[PDB]
Design a protein around this ligand. Sequence first.
Ligand SMILES: O=S(=O)(Oc1ccccc1)c1ccc(-c2ccc(O)cc2)c(-c2ccc(O)cc2)c1
Ligand SMILES: O=S(=O)(Oc1ccccc1)c1ccc(-c2ccc(O)cc2)c(-c2ccc(O)cc2)c1
Lengths: 11, 10, 239, 235
Amino acid sequence: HKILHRLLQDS
Amino acid sequence: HKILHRLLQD
Amino acid sequence: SLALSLTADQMVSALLDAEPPILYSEYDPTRPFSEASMMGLLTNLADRELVHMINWAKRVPGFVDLTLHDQVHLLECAWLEILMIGLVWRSMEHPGKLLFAPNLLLDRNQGKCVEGMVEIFDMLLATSSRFRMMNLQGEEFVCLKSIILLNSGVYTFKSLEEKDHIHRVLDKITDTLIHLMAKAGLTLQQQHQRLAQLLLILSHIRHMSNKGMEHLYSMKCKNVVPLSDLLLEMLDAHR
Amino acid sequence: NSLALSLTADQMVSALLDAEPPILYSEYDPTRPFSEASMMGLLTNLADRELVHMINWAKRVPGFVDLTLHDQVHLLECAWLEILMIGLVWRSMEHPGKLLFAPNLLLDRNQGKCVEGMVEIFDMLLATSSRFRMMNLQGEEFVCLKSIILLNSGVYTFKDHIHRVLDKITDTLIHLMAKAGLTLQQQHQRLAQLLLILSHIRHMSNKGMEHLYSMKCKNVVPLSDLLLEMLDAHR
Ligand SMILES: O=S(=O)(Oc1ccccc1)c1ccc(-c2ccc(O)cc2)c(-c2ccc(O)cc2)c1
Ligand SMILES: O=S(=O)(Oc1ccccc1)c1ccc(-c2ccc(O)cc2)c(-c2ccc(O)cc2)c1
C-alpha cells in the first residue's frame, strides 16, 4: 500500500 | 550557572 | 545466498557500480532565498534521491535475500541517515559548505534561513570535515553507507533467521573494510583504530538523522513547506 | 600531555573497572502494580541518584579530567542518557525479557505500557540486552564501551586529545579480545559489532530524550533541577 513498498516491489 | 558545574569540581 | 560467497574486492566493485548519481537542484542563483524556497528545493531534491536510493538498496549484497517487509523497515529507518552520509561525502572537498547538489552549495549563514536548521548544518559540516582529516576513501564510504542500510533498523523489527543473515553480511562488510585498510599500508593497530573511528561516526549520523527527522515533523505540521507523498510516508514511519 | 595515553591496556581496564559506579536501589514500596505517575516517579528518583554517581565515574575515566570544565559539561550533557541506558541494558543481561532498573525494580514490557511511548523504547532496550547476551559481552568490554560513549557522543558538537583517547580504548578492546582467544578476523568483527550497537544506543537516547521532554511538558511528575538542566541543552 505504501509508495516505498511499491517501488521496492517493481521488477 | 549549572548544577553540573558544582558537581564536577567536588 | 550470493552476498556471503563474495570476496572483498567483488564486494567493493559491486557497491561502487551501484552508486546512485548526483542529482541536480532546481536552484536559481538570481532568485532570492526564503525558508520555504530553500526547504522546497531540498524536499524536491531528497524526494528524487529517494527513488535512486530505493533502487540502490536493491543492489546492496544481501538486501534482496531479505523479505519485502524487512526491506521496507530498513529503508524507513535509515533513509535520512543515507541521504546525510551521501551529502557529507560529496561535501568533503568543499570546506565550510554543504554540496546538496552541484548547483546548490550552501554555507551555514544561508542554513540559518530555516529555524533551528543551523545546529544540524554545523554537525554535517563537522562530519564532513572529519571525513577530510581521515582522508576517507570512496571504497570505505560505500561500505559505511551499506552498513547503515543494514544496521540502523535491525534492532527494531518467530523466524529470527533474518537477523542472523543480516549480521553475517554486516560481518562480511567489516572484513571488506579491513581488507581495504590493509591494502593502503596500514598496520594492524592502525586498521582497528580506523575501523573504530569510521563506525563511531555512524553514531553521529544516527544523531543527525534523529534530529533532522524531528525537524521534518515540525515543517509537516507547520505546512508552510509541502512534502511529497513519498517523504510524508517515510516521515510518519518514525513518528 | 595526558596520563591516560601512557597507561597500558591492563592499566586501562583496571582503572575503568575500579571506577564502576554501584547498582542503586529503588524505593522499597512493594506496590508492584504501577501507574504512569508512580512509574516515572521511581525512575526519575533512581536516575537522579545514578547521575551523581555517573559524574564521579566520569572524572575517573582516563583522559576525562584533562579536559576543560566546559568540555566535561558538554560530554556529560550529550551522553548521560546513553550511559544510563547502556548500564540498564548491561545489568539486565541475565534477566531475559525484563529490564533490571534496580535489584528491587525488575520490569517487563507489559509494565512499560503505563507511560505513553515507554513501551517502544522498552522493546529496544530489551533487544539491546538480548543482543549483549548473545554476544557474551564481558564486563571489561562493557566499561570500554561506556567510556567510548562518554568521549564520543559530544565530540563533534564542539581536539585531537579525545580522539587519541578513543584510539587508546580501541587498542584496549582489541587487547581484551586477543586475551579471550579470538582470532584476528574475530577481533575486528566483534569490535565492529560492539560499536554498531552504539548507534542504536544513540537512537534509543534520542527517542528517550524526546519523551522526557514531553513528560516535562506534561508535568506528570515534578522533575529535579539537575534533571531539568540535563534536559535543556538537548532542545
Ligand atoms: O533537518 S535539516 O538539518 O534542516 C536543514 C535545512 C537547511 C539547511 C540545513 C539543515 C536537513 C539537513 C539535510 C537534509 C538533506 C537534504 C537532501 C539530502 O540529499 C541530504 C540531506 C534535509 C532534508 C531532507 C529531506 C527533505 O525532504 C528536506 C530536507 C534536512
Ligand atoms: O524514555 S523512556 O523509554 O521512558 C519514557 C517514555 C515516555 C515518557 C517518558 C519516559 C526511559 C527509559 C529508561 C530510563 C532510564 C532510567 C534509569 C536508568 O538507570 C536507565 C534508564 C528513562 C529515564 C531516564 C531519566 C529519568 O529521570 C527518568 C527516566 C526513561
